[PDB]
């Protein structure tokens, strides 16, 4: 009824929030990869010099 | 009543969580910019050498 509708709106929104957190975690992981790549390259430079 | 108060506490908290996710996305975007900037600069170095 309307109480069921209220619960279902809330749970649907919880799933949305969870999905956003999950996609953001993939983004965070992509930034960590990119940082490690750059750190490795800066070292190779630093050692050449 | 108290059921309404319970729902309103929960929805208010959902809005907070959403707002945190939104600000964190801006932070993620700032880190992606910073990584791209550094990648471009490391390349210019790498090509000089």
């Amino acid at each position: 009824a309307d109480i069921g509708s209220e619960f279902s709106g809330i749970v649907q929104q919880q799933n949305n929030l969870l999905r956003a957190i999950e996609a953001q975690q993939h983004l965070l992981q992509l930034t960590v990869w990119g940082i490690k790549q750059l750190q490795a390259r800066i070292l190779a430079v630093e050692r050449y010099l | 009543a108290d059921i309404g108060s319970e729902f309103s506490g929960i929805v208010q908290q959902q809005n907070n969580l959403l707002r945190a996710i939104e600000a964190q996305q801006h932070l993620l975007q700032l880190t992606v910019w910073g990584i791209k900037q550094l990648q471009a600069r490391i390349l210019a170095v790498e090509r000089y050498l």
Binding site: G9, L30, G34, Q37 | -
Partner: peptide
């Protein structure tokens, strides 16, 4: 070719950002 792979990286970033914007768009209508 890290170039092809940094291009991969960028496309992955772009895809996840597009998905997050989509989810945020659906979360405002709730």
């Amino acid at each position: 070719w890290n170039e092809m792979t940094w291009m991969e990286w960028e496309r992955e970033i772009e895809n996840y950002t597009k998905l997050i914007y989509k989810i945020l768009e659906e979360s405002q209508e709730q």
